[PDB]
């Protein structure tokens, strides 16, 4: 079992410490890809987390085909939303999406099944 320290802030963190943050979309890339079911996830250093399974895929509409979106998101947007949410974010940056990793963790601590 790995462990691995994510800086998050205090406005994401908090729905990862209400729970509604289960699934983790966000680039691949070395790292955190390589995370694991087993691993642990420490949220902003204070807040572990286990892996509850780790799946790779493509195309943001896979992940929301297989993860949904109130999930991944707390805003709980709309499958239309979610795709300019996820083409919106750094506009000046803008180039066409890529990396789509379903991370899914469960917060250690709270009561669950």
């Given at each position: 079992?790995?462990?691995y320290?994510?800086?998050?802030?205090?406005?994401?963190?908090?729905?990862?410490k209400?729970?509604?943050?289960?699934?983790?979309?966000?680039?691949?890339?070395?790292?955190?890809?390589?995370?694991?079911?087993?691993?642990?996830?420490?949220?902003?250093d204070?807040?572990?987390?286990e892996?509850?399974?780790?799946?790779?895929?493509?195309?943001?509409?896979?992940?929301?085909?297989?993860?949904?979106?109130?999930?991944?998101?707390?805003?709980?947007?709309?499958?239309?939303?979610?795709?300019?949410?996820?083409?919106?974010?750094?506009?000046?940056?803008?180039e066409?999406?890529?990396?789509?990793?379903?991370?899914?963790?469960?917060?250690?601590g709270?009561?669950?099944?």
């Amino acid at each position: 079992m790995k462990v691995y320290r994510l800086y998050l802030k205090d406005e994401y963190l908090e729905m990862v410490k209400s729970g509604k943050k289960r699934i983790e979309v966000r680039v691949a890339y070395p790292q955190l890809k390589d995370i694991k079911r087993g691993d642990k996830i420490i949220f902003n250093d204070l807040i572990p987390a286990e892996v509850v399974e780790v799946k790779k895929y493509e195309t943001f509409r896979q992940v929301l085909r297989e993860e949904p979106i109130d999930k991944i998101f707390p805003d709980k947007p709309s499958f239309e939303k979610a795709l300019k949410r996820f083409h919106n974010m750094y506009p000046k940056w803008k180039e066409y999406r890529y990396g789509v990793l379903a991370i899914k963790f469960r917060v250690l601590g709270r009561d669950k099944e």
